[PDB]
Amino acid sequence: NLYFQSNAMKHCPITYEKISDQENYSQRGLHLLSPQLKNLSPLDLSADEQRQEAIARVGKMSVQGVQKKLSAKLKIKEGCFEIVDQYGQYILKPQSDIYPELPENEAITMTLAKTIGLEVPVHGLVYSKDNSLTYFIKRFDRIGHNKKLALEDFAQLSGEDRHTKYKSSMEKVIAVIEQFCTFPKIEFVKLFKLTLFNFLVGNEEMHLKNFSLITKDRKISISPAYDLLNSTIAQKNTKEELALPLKGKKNNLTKSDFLKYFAIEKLGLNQNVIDGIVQEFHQVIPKWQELIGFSFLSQEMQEKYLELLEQRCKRLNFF
Ligand SMILES: Nc1ncnc2c1ncn2[C@@H]1O[C@H](COP(=O)(O)OP(=O)(O)CP(=O)(O)O)[C@@H](O)[C@H]1O
Ligand SMILES: [Mg+2]
Ligand SMILES: [Mg+2]
């Protein structure tokens, strides 16, 4: 119980809960993938081999972006992922050959998002042949018996071409929600939480194609979250804070920019709702700090994350 001459307390690469030396994952985490999943075998490819497969398969896959990714199915009885080109059930993101600790960063950041009540798909880390960690996330547009749900990103919805990521604004993002979502006021609360979250965790890369609407449960809503990571600590010499301007600003954002201009003037949220969300963030910060300390980020990357988080929290008076 003192962890002085024995392994430090181990944490699950899916849930971050305490696990024993003989376990690689917690039962709770494995069962988020499937109630019958017994284990998750390491990927039989090194990080470099995963990146090469990503390059070879990109044109055959139904998901695309800047970073290296693979599509995969979960073989439940065999207890492993299988790489596929079509009908992916999961996306796998191997280590970058450029940026440090990208899978570990995205994994913990997506977990922080879940803890503040954002809708986040099942996600986690899986070991590789070279002991490197690869990030995985469930496809939220393929459910049940390989049934596809309709999904469109905000570039498509705002009449831009498929490459437009930055030539937009948070005000245009709001306008898309107002135009298309079934219950825009509910989605505005979600966008408020997501935008504060991205500021607190250093995600300066929440671009237009990271916003999507989905048709599910007999309504059109903002999709489950994807691609949330602390991009500031993974990059060097980052100066901007927001990918898309708010009030014409991508840097030097103020508390009133978020809590008055954005929350009240642009989103129309009632003051009691704003205060309640602020209190939610205030209460969650110690849990986030604990989770970062339990994460698979290196000690040095944890310190960068915690330092930035505390700076951003001070700017919003969330302490
Ligand atoms: N869990 C998920 N379920 C369904 N679709 C997903 C998904 N995650 C990502 N996608 C789809 O794949 C696209 C690219 O995803 P993502 O943004 O994570 O790529 P990426 O890792 O290459 C980083 P970047 O955004 O900088 O290109 C998304 O816009 C979305 O259409
Ligand atoms: Mg990005
Ligand atoms: Mg992004």
Residue numbers in the entry: -7 to 311
Source paper text:
Here, we perform structural and biochemical characterization of the Legionella pneumophila effector Lpg2370, demonstrating that it is a Ser/Thr kinase. Together with two upstream genes, lpg2370 constitutes the tripartite HipBST TA. Notably, the toxin Lpg2370 (HipTLp) and the antitoxin Lpg2369 (HipSLp) correspond to the C-terminus and N-terminus of HipA from HipBA TA, respectively. Structural analysis reveals that HipSLp binding induces a loop-to-helix shift in the P-loop of HipTLp, leading to the blockage of ATP binding and inhibition of the kinase activity.
